[PDB]
Structure 1
Amino acid sequence: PLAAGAVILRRFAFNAAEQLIRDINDVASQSPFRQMVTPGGYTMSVAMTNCGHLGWTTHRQGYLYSPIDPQTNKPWPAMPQSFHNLCQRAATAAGYPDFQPDACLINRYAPGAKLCLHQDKDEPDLRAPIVSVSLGLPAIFQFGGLKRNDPLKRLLLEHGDVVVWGGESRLFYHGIQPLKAGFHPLTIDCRYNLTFRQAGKK
């Protein structure tokens, strides 16, 4: 048990990974990866894009979900069926049979790239979990608690691993340590992560 409400499902997406990676390439050929700039003016080391009906984005004013890619001025690409199917099966296996994501943020890590501890809290309906799928190079995941200083668990996430948090762990701090260089036959020299969220409704 990763924490109350939280599971790691090791190698859960390993058989779906080839198709997932083809579809990430397709998503990116419409809304390219870009390193976004925080409100305070720093360029993130992780490159990002989104698919689905809502996409996570930084603004001068803060963070937000938008139906429009602000770089292309066009809707984000539709969420691929391969993504939505894997998400629905991982959710179900982790105990969240009703999750309906309408947003998928896609992170790409080059060697050196990191994601500092943060909370996912931009979603209006905190009852829905987050589903996180890992592809390519391995990375160390930090998973804390409700307070930034709460002790961290560190876990290696390998190609195909899926983590799901929700309920009591929904607002826990988490992040990614600087990516080590290396080789993966499917991604060559990077790691991808797909994070599914329910970002609309109410």
Structure 2
Amino acid sequence: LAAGAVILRRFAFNAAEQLIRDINDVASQSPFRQMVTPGGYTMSVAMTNCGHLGWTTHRQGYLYSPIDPQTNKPWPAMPQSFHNLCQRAATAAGYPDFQPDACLINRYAPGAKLSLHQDKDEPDLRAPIVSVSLGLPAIFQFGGLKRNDPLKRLLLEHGDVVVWGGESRLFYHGIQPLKAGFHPLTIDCRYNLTFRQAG
């Protein structure tokens, strides 16, 4: 059970093929790279962005930047398929006003994980985050306000869209090591799109 979170399973099933074609298109301008945390450690999850702003690691910490620090060019524009799905998802969740300007694209190879963290780099915490899962299934784990808070698990499969609004927006969360397997559309990985209001 989650407060403020609206889970729309298999919502992105029909849009899925075009989203993957558009992830590949975004990836040809801003390649997938495994970002280095401020402490000097490379993340197992490969990331890239699209939209006006993009989430990235820096020496001083985490920030949103209109420039890709690797290519030194701006991030690719948010694809229309991305805009359309997020809009329909947010409207179905009770957020018709949500206008994202950043989309963090995560690629999970077999065994890739994402340790517990909070999404607190956005200016307005009242605004939700629309998450779209594609490819192989992954176990999403969420806690509470603190670190040693009781963890709950959720499987996020292909096409699943979760809108993290209300209280769930500030919860500690992460992804457990991706189980090896096969998916017809992504072959051996999982993709996750997190639409954010970063400006």
Normalised by the size of structure 2, how large is the TM-score? 0.98
Q: CA deviation at 1:152?
A: 1.5
Q: Gapped runs of 5+ residues in structure 1?
A: none
Q: 1:76-111 deviations in whole A, cap 9, x for unaligned?
A: 000001001100111111111211100000000000
Taking the aligned partners of 1:84 and 1:12, their CA distance within structure 2 comes to: 14
| 1:90 aligned counterpart, secondary structure | helix
Q: Which residue of 2 aligns with 1:129?
A: 128
Q: CA deviation at 1:20?
A: 0.3
Q: 1:65-85 deviations in whole A, cap 9, x for unaligned?
A: 000001111110000010011
1:45 aligns with 2:44: yes
Which deviates further from its counterpart, 151-160 or 25-34? 151-160
| 2:147 aligned counterpart, secondary structure | coil
Q: 1:148-174 deviations in whole A, cap 9, x for unaligned?
A: 222121011110001111222221111
Taking the aligned partners of 2:132 and 2:148, their CA distance within structure 1 comes to: 26
RMSD of aligned Cα (Å): 0.8
Q: 1:111-160 deviations in whole A, cap 9, x for unaligned?
A: 01000011001000111101100000000001212222221210111100
4+ runs deviating over 6 angstroms: none
Percent identity over the alignment is 99
Q: Which residue of 2 aligns with 1:111?
A: 110
Taking the aligned partners of 1:132 and 1:144, their CA distance within structure 2 comes to: 17
Which deviates further from its counterpart, 126-135 or 147-156? 147-156
Q: Which residue of 1 aligns with 2:185?
A: 186
| 1:170 aligned counterpart, secondary structure | helix
Taking the aligned partners of 1:186 and 1:192, their CA distance within structure 2 comes to: 11
1:21 aligns with 2:51: no
Q: CA deviation at 1:193?
A: 0.2
Taking the aligned partners of 1:146 and 1:86, their CA distance within structure 2 comes to: 30
Q: Gapped runs of 5+ residues in structure 2?
A: none
Taking the aligned partners of 1:143 and 1:161, their CA distance within structure 2 comes to: 16
| 1:91 aligned counterpart, secondary structure | helix
| 2:10 aligned counterpart, secondary structure | coil
Which deviates further from its counterpart, 97-106 or 166-175? 166-175
Q: Note if contact 2:33-2:46 (Cα within 8 Å) is conserved in structure 1.
A: yes
Q: Which residue of 1 aligns with 2:169?
A: 170
Q: Which residue of 1 aligns with 2:78?
A: 79
Taking the aligned partners of 1:92 and 1:149, their CA distance within structure 2 comes to: 34
| 1:168 aligned counterpart, secondary structure | helix
Normalised by the size of structure 1, how large is the TM-score? 0.97
Taking the aligned partners of 2:179 and 2:4, their CA distance within structure 1 comes to: 29
Which deviates further from its counterpart, 146-155 or 42-51? 146-155
Taking the aligned partners of 1:155 and 1:108, their CA distance within structure 2 comes to: 18
Taking the aligned partners of 2:12 and 2:174, their CA distance within structure 1 comes to: 20
Taking the aligned partners of 1:170 and 1:11, their CA distance within structure 2 comes to: 21
Q: Note if contact 2:6-2:165 (Cα within 8 Å) is conserved in structure 1.
A: no
Q: 1:11-37 deviations in whole A, cap 9, x for unaligned?
A: 010110000000000000000000000
| 2:105 aligned counterpart, secondary structure | strand
Taking the aligned partners of 2:145 and 2:25, their CA distance within structure 1 comes to: 36
